[PDB]
Amino acid sequence: GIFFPALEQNMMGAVLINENDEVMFFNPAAEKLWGYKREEVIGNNIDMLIPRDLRPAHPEYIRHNREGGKARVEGMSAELQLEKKDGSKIWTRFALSKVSAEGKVYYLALVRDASVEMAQKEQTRQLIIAVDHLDRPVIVLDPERHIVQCNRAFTEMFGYCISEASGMQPDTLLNTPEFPADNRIRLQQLLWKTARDQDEFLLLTRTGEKIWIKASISPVYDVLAHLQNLVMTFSDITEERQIRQLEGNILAAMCSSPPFHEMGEIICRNIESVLNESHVSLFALRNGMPIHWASSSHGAEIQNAQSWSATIRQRDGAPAGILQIKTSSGAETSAFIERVADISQHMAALALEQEKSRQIQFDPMTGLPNRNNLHNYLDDLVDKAVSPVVYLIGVDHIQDVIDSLGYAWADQALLEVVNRFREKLKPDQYLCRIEGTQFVLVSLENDVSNITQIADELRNVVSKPIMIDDKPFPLTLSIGISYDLGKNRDYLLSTAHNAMDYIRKNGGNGWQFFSPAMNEMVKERLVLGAALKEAISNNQLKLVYQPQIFAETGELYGIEALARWHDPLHGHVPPSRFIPLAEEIGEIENIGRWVIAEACRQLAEWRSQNIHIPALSVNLSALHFRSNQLPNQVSDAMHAWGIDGHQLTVEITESMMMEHDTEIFKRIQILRDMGVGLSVDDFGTGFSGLSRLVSLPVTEIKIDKSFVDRCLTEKRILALLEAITSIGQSLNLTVVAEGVETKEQFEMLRKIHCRVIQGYFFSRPLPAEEIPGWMSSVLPLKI
Amino acid sequence: GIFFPALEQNMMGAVLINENDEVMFFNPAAEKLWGYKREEVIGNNIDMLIPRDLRPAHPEYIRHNREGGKARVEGMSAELQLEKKDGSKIWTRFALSKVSAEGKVYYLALVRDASVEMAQKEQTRQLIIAVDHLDRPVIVLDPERHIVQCNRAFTEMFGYCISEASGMQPDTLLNTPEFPADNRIRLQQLLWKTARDQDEFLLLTRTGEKIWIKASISPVYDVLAHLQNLVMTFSDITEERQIRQLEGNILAAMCSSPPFHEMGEIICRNIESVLNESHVSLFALRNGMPIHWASSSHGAEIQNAQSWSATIRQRDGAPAGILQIKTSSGAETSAFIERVADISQHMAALALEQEKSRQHIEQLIQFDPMTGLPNRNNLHNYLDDLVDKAVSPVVYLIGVDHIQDVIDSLGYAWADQALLEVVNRFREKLKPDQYLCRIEGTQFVLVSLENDVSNITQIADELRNVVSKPIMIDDKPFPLTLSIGISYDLGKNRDYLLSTAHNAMDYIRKNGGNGWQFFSPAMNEMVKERLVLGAALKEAISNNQLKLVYQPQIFAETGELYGIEALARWHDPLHGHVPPSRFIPLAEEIGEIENIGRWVIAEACRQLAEWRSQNIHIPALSVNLSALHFRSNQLPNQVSDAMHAWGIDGHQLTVEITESMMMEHDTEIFKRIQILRDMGVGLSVDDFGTGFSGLSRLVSLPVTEIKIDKSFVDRCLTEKRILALLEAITSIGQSLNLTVVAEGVETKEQFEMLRKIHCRVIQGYFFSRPLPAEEIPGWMSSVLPLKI
Numbered sequence A: 001g002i003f004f005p006a007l008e009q010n011m012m013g014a015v016l017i018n019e020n021d022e023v024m025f026f027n028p029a030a031e032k033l034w035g036y037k038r039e040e041v042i043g044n045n046i047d048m049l050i051p052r053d054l055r056p057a058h059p060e061y062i063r064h065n066r067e068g069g070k071a072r073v074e075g076m077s078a079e080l081q082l083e084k085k086d087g088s089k090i091w092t093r094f095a096l097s098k099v100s101a102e103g104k105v106y107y108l109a110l111v112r113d114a115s116v117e118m119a120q121k122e123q124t125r126q127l128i129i130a131v132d133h134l135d136r137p138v139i140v141l142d143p144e145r146h147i148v149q150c151n152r153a154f155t156e157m158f159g160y161c162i163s164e165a166s167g168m169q170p171d172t173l174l175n176t177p178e179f180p181a182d183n184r185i186r187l188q189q190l191l192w193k194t195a196r197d198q199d200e201f202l203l204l205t206r207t208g209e210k211i212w213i214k215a216s217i218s219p220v221y222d223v224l225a226h227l228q229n230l231v232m233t234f235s236d237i238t239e240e241r242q243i244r245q246l247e248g249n250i251l252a253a254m255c256s257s258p259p260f261h262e263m264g265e266i267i268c269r270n271i272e273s274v275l276n277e278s279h280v281s282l283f284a285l286r287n288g289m290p291i292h293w294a295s296s297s298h299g300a301e302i303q304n305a306q307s308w309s310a311t312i313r314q315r316d317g318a319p320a321g322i323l324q325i326k327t328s329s330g331a332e333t334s335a336f337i338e339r340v341a342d343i344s345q346h347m348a349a350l351a352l353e354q355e356k357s358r359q360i361q362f363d364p365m366t367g368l369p370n371r372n373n374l375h376n377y378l379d380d381l382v383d384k385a386v387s388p389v390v391y392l393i394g395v396d397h398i399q400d401v402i403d404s405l406g407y408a409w410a411d412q413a414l415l416e417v418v419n420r421f422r423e424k425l426k427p428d429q430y431l432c433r434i435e436g437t438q439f440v441l442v443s444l445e446n447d448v449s450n451i452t453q454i455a456d457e458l459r460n461v462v463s464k465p466i467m468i469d470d471k472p473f474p475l476t477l478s479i480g481i482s483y484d485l486g487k488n489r490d491y492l493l494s495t496a497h498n499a500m501d502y503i504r505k506n507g508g509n510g511w512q513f514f515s516p517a518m519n520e521m522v523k524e525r526l527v528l529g530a531a532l533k534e535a536i537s538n539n540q541l542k543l544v545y546q547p548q549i550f551a552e553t554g555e556l557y558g559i560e561a562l563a564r565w566h567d568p569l570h571g572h573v574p575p576s577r578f579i580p581l582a583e584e585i586g587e588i589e590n591i592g593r594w595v596i597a598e599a600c601r602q603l604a605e606w607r608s609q610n611i612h613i614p615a616l617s618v619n620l621s622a623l624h625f626r627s628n629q630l631p632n633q634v635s636d637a638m639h640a641w642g643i644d645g646h647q648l649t650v651e652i653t654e655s656m657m658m659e660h661d662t663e664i665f666k667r668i669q670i671l672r673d674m675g676v677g678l679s680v681d682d683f684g685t686g687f688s689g690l691s692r693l694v695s696l697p698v699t700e701i702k703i704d705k706s707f708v709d710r711c712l713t714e715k716r717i718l719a720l721l722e723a724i725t726s727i728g729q730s731l732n733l734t735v736v737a738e739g740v741e742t743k744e745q746f747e748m749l750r751k752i753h754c755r756v757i758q759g760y761f762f763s764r765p766l767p768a769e770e771i772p773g774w775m776s777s778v779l780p781l782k783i
Numbered sequence B: 001g002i003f004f005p006a007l008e009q010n011m012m013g014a015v016l017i018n019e020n021d022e023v024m025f026f027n028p029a030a031e032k033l034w035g036y037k038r039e040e041v042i043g044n045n046i047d048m049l050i051p052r053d054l055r056p057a058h059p060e061y062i063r064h065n066r067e068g069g070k071a072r073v074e075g076m077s078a079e080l081q082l083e084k085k086d087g088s089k090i091w092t093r094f095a096l097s098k099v100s101a102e103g104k105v106y107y108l109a110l111v112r113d114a115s116v117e118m119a120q121k122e123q124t125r126q127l128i129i130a131v132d133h134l135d136r137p138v139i140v141l142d143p144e145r146h147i148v149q150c151n152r153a154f155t156e157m158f159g160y161c162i163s164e165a166s167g168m169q170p171d172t173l174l175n176t177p178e179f180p181a182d183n184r185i186r187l188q189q190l191l192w193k194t195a196r197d198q199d200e201f202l203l204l205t206r207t208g209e210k211i212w213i214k215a216s217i218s219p220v221y222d223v224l225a226h227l228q229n230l231v232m233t234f235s236d237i238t239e240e241r242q243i244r245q246l247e248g249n250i251l252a253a254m255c256s257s258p259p260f261h262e263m264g265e266i267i268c269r270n271i272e273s274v275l276n277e278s279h280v281s282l283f284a285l286r287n288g289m290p291i292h293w294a295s296s297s298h299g300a301e302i303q304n305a306q307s308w309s310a311t312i313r314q315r316d317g318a319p320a321g322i323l324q325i326k327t328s329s330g331a332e333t334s335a336f337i338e339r340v341a342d343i344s345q346h347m348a349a350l351a352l353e354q355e356k357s358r359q360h361i362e363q364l365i366q367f368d369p370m371t372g373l374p375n376r377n378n379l380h381n382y383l384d385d386l387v388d389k390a391v392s393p394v395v396y397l398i399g400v401d402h403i404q405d406v407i408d409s410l411g412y413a414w415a416d417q418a419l420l421e422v423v424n425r426f427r428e429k430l431k432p433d434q435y436l437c438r439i440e441g442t443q444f445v446l447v448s449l450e451n452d453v454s455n456i457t458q459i460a461d462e463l464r465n466v467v468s469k470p471i472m473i474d475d476k477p478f479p480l481t482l483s484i485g486i487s488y489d490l491g492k493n494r495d496y497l498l499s500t501a502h503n504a505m506d507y508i509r510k511n512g513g514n515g516w517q518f519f520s521p522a523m524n525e526m527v528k529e530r531l532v533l534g535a536a537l538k539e540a541i542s543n544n545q546l547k548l549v550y551q552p553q554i555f556a557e558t559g560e561l562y563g564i565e566a567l568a569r570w571h572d573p574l575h576g577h578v579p580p581s582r583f584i585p586l587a588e589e590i591g592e593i594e595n596i597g598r599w600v601i602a603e604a605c606r607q608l609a610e611w612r613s614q615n616i617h618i619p620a621l622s623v624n625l626s627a628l629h630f631r632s633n634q635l636p637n638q639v640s641d642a643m644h645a646w647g648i649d650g651h652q653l654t655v656e657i658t659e660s661m662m663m664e665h666d667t668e669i670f671k672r673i674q675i676l677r678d679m680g681v682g683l684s685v686d687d688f689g690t691g692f693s694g695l696s697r698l699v700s701l702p703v704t705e706i707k708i709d710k711s712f713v714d715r716c717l718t719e720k721r722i723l724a725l726l727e728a729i730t731s732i733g734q735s736l737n738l739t740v741v742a743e744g745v746e747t748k749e750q751f752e753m754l755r756k757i758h759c760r761v762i763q764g765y766f767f768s769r770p771l772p773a774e775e776i777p778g779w780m781s782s783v784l785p786l787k788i
């Protein structure tokens, strides 16, 4: 029987009904839930307890129950509304039990006051407000830094729904692009920071888009100070970071007060970097009226263009300029555009303040002179009637340095550039710094060949990357050359800058003159060089041989081999012309090895009929023979053909003997070790040079055409020739002469006991043929 | 009874225990909750259901309740923690009953699973925490506009808590203004009409302050229509203007570029201006630790202030500073303080980047824009490099004296020009190893690598003589003077060098100027010695105290004497022997080279005229002009007078020239040597020169003979290419009628092998040390032709 007293003692409401729905038990909890009294809750069936409207449904329901046959009731499992005795309606929960005994079915109902519905509804309200009219990504974290609750804005922005965002840390949840250092490590630092903190990151959503966000941690502790949870805000600063980077770049601009138009340029390209595919224009108040300050390089039409005009205002509020922007409709949000407009307007006003706040003779950066020194120097050149060739050099691709590293490294790059220019500067060449990027190089040599060489040297001096702290920014040069006779300095500077700008705009990395005719003359020289390269490539050049003979018996001493080139398109062109051109092309080694190889082959070819050919001499000084060529360039020819090695001789000048390094000295020594005779020009530089001469057996000294010339006119050179022949006779050397054309020359030269003679007197240079004819016909010309 | 199956069939968890505290009822819900099958729980004690953490403290409460006998159990009114069979923990609610039946005590327990219930509870708590951290004040409303849920932003915006304004109508709590009828009517309509309104109104706080607020009522419409809930999102439209104002003002501070400390101060004062009462401090990180940058002067204590820490980040992102702001609690909400922290952090990072940029630019800026010489930083770098090279420098500190008077009198327009031509005169006498710098104003620095005092005094003398010609400015003379302090010490760092050099600078300046000095009496006594040595040398030249010592030279195969070479000497009663290699440089420094040259030539001519008395005697005589530093205005006149005053045929004497000075340069002493050749003086050379031009000048005017320096012949035996050079020289001499001579031949082997290559005359100790002038006629006719 204890069920009744226990149930009425229990604070859970209990109602008991029989098969006829008559009530037997109704606990005081049910009494206070309904308001009726047990003397009346019986009544007729269950009429009093049920709300009057739902009444008719209830019998059929329980009828269905006694027809259902199920041992469990799925009904009343949800929340329910109960009408009280006074007609008020409250929330409640029900539970049901069906029993069978004595052939009759009874039911018991348990009732609860439902104090949890207040919690459910309050939770629904704050679930509404966490999302509604607030696109504010907020997430919350456990002590283990696990996502516990995230709102609609966060799922919408970062694509990861709550089902796919829970149970894992935010960083592991987050797809992160590879900085690779910062945007990875600082995320972990912030996510594990214990105190309030914040940072900025670049992140990738589930759609692969790049965004910039700002993440803030602020933890919360319970009463006992243990860490309960953490809360994180996820503002999207991808538009704001553009504004902040705009600010940083523009400040790095005015840090050094560049010129006015330049300042407009930084403003404009920063705006363009901020507003994609737009147009920007600026005007400033000069003399009281608006005048154009700067504009963007873009000038194409804009579809659905929207224009905003902002009047620049100073601190006092007086107008100072107008900034105008045109943007396509739908490209950017309006609020972002207006924000950019006003912040840039403020910075333009500040730039104007700096400009009118700003408003000796050498450079305090690298030490080069400033524009005043160049002006004075050119003026001192002009008054005494000398034409200076003026190169204007503009350094290019510095904008990468300025944008990526500010000015404090652009000027370091400029210093490195100036060091490289000075390292190869020649004296009388004047280097000056005009302003910022530009330089002016002044040189008095008006030769086109030298000008081309200087320009090429400058262009290629910047070939190596400019190494600045493990960051090779490549830089280029744009050179404008001006040279005209009898023109003052302003014209030269103006045309130099015009040429520099022309090269820069068309792409840079190059050079150009101003005068058009000789700017085509350089092209024609390049054409000649192309023809010469073709000729040397397909071995068309020839070697004309000129004989030199003894002055006593007339027996053949030897014959020099001289390069010659006759072209169908260009005709005869002398070696004195196409050797300097060759070194301009820098292909002298080709001519050298071809000349050597062809001479060896020709000696072999002559050997098949007559071996009596005494000696063949190649003048390597006039051929501008380099240093490293000698060993291989002689050894390959020696071994390739049937030439012995004691028949062909090589000539070297004194400057090339022991100057411009000394590796060439032993490179000639090894060639002597091969056994090829040598020939020296001056043998000077004192007793050391003489020691080298005797130690390197030369066996023959040549007298240049000039000394033999005027030999019958100037007494000093006469005595010099006596000295030379006396020294030669003393040692084991045979002295040769060049440029002999008359009879008195030969007479006096033989009078001084000069051994052998060459020139036009005996034989005009015969071509590759009719040398055996000359040798068989008139070889013993006992004159 | 039917209640046993009833409780068997309730969703409720039914358990009953008897007096023996043994469980005798268990239901499917108990199966879900406890996890133990009824076959395991029936017959088990109540302690089975008790969790571990309370087992020792289980029964006493039930004893106590039994003793009390109260029907309404006070306990189990709270939440309970139950442990499952597998060890997991869940939360359950209990409903109890005490039964006194059949003369016994029974306890009935009913267990409900509130896992959903408390999950809802913690979800509510988490959501409260989350909504409180929203940057903007937001409120929920019921259909009749019950203010049901506010958040911390709304509390910190007005003052109301959840309990204070819980469902009590907004118009009554909002404390709307009474005077503006239009404002209050519009606000009431906004609260009432169910459109998406974004109107703005003035509202009042507990401090009686009128604040602009934008309401954003956006009612919700459920799926069943008949909208119920409304959502309000108040915003402050006066804080944003203040943030923009702070941005602009701090950027204007940026643009004038004050120094680091001034800018930090302006940042903090602006922040304090925004937040009515606050203290702001800034730390800039150096080497990982924070150096104080600036804090506002309002250092008064704040009662229960709230701090805020932001980590300033560099342009790349490396942390660079800490910013801490403290404001009195309740003055501003969390959002406004966080926003000002963010805006200020960006600008502080800008200031740090600008300061770093200026540090990098100034490290290499200012290399004397006026005259172009290197400036003090360049000098410090160069001296540091020299010290790292372990090479001791000599540093001159140079100061101009009279320039300050002209500055005081004629201003800068003359001083700048004067210093300009001073530097111009200096540069005309530099050297490749000499490095000039302009430390400051009218002070300069010269750096050299010469440690011999003989060179140092000469350098100082030419520098002093730079101003021998007074500066010409606008037809006006200005005789500026110099005061120079030299420092040179091994191992001392650069700072000591500059410090002591400036000490010597001051010492030689305040004494009157126009002078030079060392700083150490340990190196100044040398120059003090040298002045009197030079005075003695001048006295000796005047009184003719010197001596001439004769060394002969004889033939290499004949044995006869070819001639004699004249050498000069000095014996003094104080300093004793003093060699020519130490008093010809001294004669140079006094500029008495002309006098000693004249004395040697005149004495040689006198000896020849005296020796002609007995017989013809001497074949030929030589004087080394190169060793005597003879100048361009000394040869012809001195030789001509020497051989005119006495009687000399000219064939007797020869002069030796190093051929280095024989170059035309700017003197053209070719005419002088040609004149000397015309008057019969023999000539001697040592090298040919550049090339054919050199041989031409050697053979045009006939150089009688050529000498091999002692350096060559001292190494002839060891090296072969010396021998080749020797044979070449001898062959050239034979060819051109040149008389090769050798100086310094010592032993017999050298003489024999030089005879093998026909050197043809030998001069050295091997036949005679240089004898005094008197023993010679006692040697010409005693040792005789030496045919060894």
Ligand code: HEM
Binding pocket: A015, A016, A017, A049, A050, A051, A054, A058, A061, A062, A064, A065, A073, A074, A075, A076, A077, A078, A080, A081, A082, A096, A107, A108, A109
């Ligand atoms: C004022 C008190 C009551 C109200 C307002 C009420 C209301 C309802 C309602 C709305 C349903 C259908 C949906 C649902 O179950 O949630 C229902 C079902 C049912 N009720 Fe009641 N009820 C009350 C009392 C009782 C009592 C005391 C008993 C038996 C002792 C009972 C027996 C049943 C049965 C058997 C069903 C069928 C559930 C099914 O078929 O799934 N009801 N009741």
Ligand code: HEM
Binding pocket: B017, B046, B049, B050, B051, B054, B061, B062, B065, B072, B073, B074, B075, B076, B077, B078, B080, B081, B082, B083, B096, B107, B108, B109
């Ligand atoms: C997981 C199982 C249980 C836990 C964790 C537990 C724990 C507690 C605790 C700590 C109290 C005292 C403080 C309070 O009520 O908030 C209490 C009250 C009480 N519980 Fe338990 N108990 C458990 C099971 C039981 C069982 C199985 C019974 C009886 C069949 C029982 C009977 C009582 C009684 C009589 C009181 C004191 C009532 C009063 O003083 O008014 N408890 N329970």
